[PDB]
Amino acid sequence: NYDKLIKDFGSHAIDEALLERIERVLGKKPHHFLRRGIFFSHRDLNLLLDVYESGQPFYLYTGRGPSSESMHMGHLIPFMFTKWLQDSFRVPLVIQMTDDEKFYFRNIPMEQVEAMTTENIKDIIAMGFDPELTFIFRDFDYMGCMYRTVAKIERAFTASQVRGCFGFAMEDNCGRWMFPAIQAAPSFSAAFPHIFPPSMGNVFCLIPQAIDQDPYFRLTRDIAPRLGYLKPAVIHSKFFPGLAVLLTDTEKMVKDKINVDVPIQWLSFFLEDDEELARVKKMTGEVKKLLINTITAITKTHQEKRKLVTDEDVQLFTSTRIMGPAKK
Template sequence: MPDNYKDYTDEEKKQIVEFDKKMSADNEKLIGLFGAKKLKDMSLPAFYTFKNGLMYSHRDFDVFMERLNKHEKSAIVSGFNPSASIHIGHIGVFDTNLFFQKEYGMDIFVPLSDDESYVSGKIKDQKDGLVNSLKLIRSLIAYGYDKNKTHFIIDQIYTNIYNLAIKLSRGITMSEVKDVYGYTNDQNTGLHFYPAIQSAHVIFPQTLGIRNILVPIGPDEDAHIRVSRDLAPKFGYEKVAVLHSRFMPGFDGDSKMSKSKGNAVFLLDDEKAIKKIVLNAFSGGRASVDEHRKLGGIPEIDISYLYLKYLFLDKDEAEKLYDDYRHGRVLSGEMKKLLLEKVLERTEKFKENYSKVTAKDIKKSIMVNEEIDLDSVIEKLGIFS
């Protein structure tokens, strides 16, 4: 370390510990209370989300990789709620999905839970759910998902999924649903039934003969997969493997990313909106330039540094930036501008790709009932008009 390196004060250490607890609390809860394991003591893929610790914990990932490396046909299930849009916080899981798709030629199944959005009141009606789902499919293909090896499931136009849900529903009791999800008697029956549908999404590839399944998720989604893992053996299916990403906070440094909170960067946002969010991100900088040059910043709690570290820089680059920021050679404003540059580069490329995706592209990868005319549905909804 340089001679002028200064250790953190007790107060700064307390800040770091509290921030780190917030960042890893969900993952540690899964490990401490629900039997998940940290990603260690195993051979991990040579991909950035594993190298830098963005992928944090798992269930049976070692078993999944062993079977995959023996060339067993495998797949990923990675769902999305169509009441939301893609933001920067999603790209770690997306990039991990695409790594497996490109490296192993793996199929990816993407359930878009339009029905859950409806029964939970996140959208006005089912038409909204369908429109949002089709827009998300366009976004995911623009992001890089292979339209020939990605299979999108929108339940209202692939209602076959409900047959599997009905089959699985006999294995779930109301007591379990209330215990896991906290639902009460005054909430609608659609919510109480939805765990069976979500389990059907997770198990579905096994009905096609693909039994080695990986589900990459955020730590807050683990309860859904625990239900499906409990159900699977009751009906002759296998428990899916689970990969938990590290929780990434909103740009305010305090809470989950959300449009309503104004703390998220969405991939289709314009440059002005992105600048406003990134340049106002929570920082570990000091009150003045002179103080920052003298004492150095606190990268462990700096949102811009954390996003650069986990999503945009390799290990050597992240370590150098850490050292420069810690010793006052890089200012907070400079850190934010570096992140802004990386984010704009990513979002501009995404928007360019988005503009090129056609109705033919999305149609190719959507699973539908035989009687549904998908061309007519897409044209009627005006997704590309």
């Protein structure tokens, strides 16, 4: 199923040798996503690790499209894994809020997008991300900081090509046509001089993304050296299986929504200790009791954490303060 996808996207499987490498590099066991093979494929990860073991820094880049809702459980994966990578490797994390993208795609008024984006930013800060090494940005504000790197990608991409990947119609607005380069830009360390100074050159980027999005992104990877940039490394996740459950849900709703292969999979994602998964993996309703318990905590913890996130925290995480390798 997945081994077939690896072959024709062409990618690279995460083997046992690479798991042993991650372990001796960090001095710990890998995250359960890796041990259980949820994050299963990659591009250039070995290069990134070479770089790290040499004392060079790298960074992480994930993004988040604003919704007028709260994150689904399945949306947590890359943030859960990102946060681990960041804690472990002690590296910067750049989180892009694609407020311009929501604005261009749906016909919604900007002040409504901006307002929902604020709320999505709070959901993220509530995950416990370290503000010493994490930078959340709004395209509407941070474009212009990074416009030069955006401009270099816009000039590299042709209308025909982005049409090809994304399937834009002529009756689609210009905002949609131009956005792909904005999404590309963060893959490149030049986009963040307040964290990677241009006098130090390129810093490697690692992007966690579900395997399905890879075909967009061969575009942005192959054009890196023409810009003298560093083709960014990628680590691929397996699909999250649906049913949805939201972070704002009460115990009752989580209990109700849940009540068979699918739930065992949910536990593969969320239950932390391994032997208790193995014990389980050997009635249907007793399973569901365990999943509802473990999810409830995650949500309850998130709800409890969110209510302390304040407007200054949002300003703090969004500000362009000197970070990471700008310790000089």
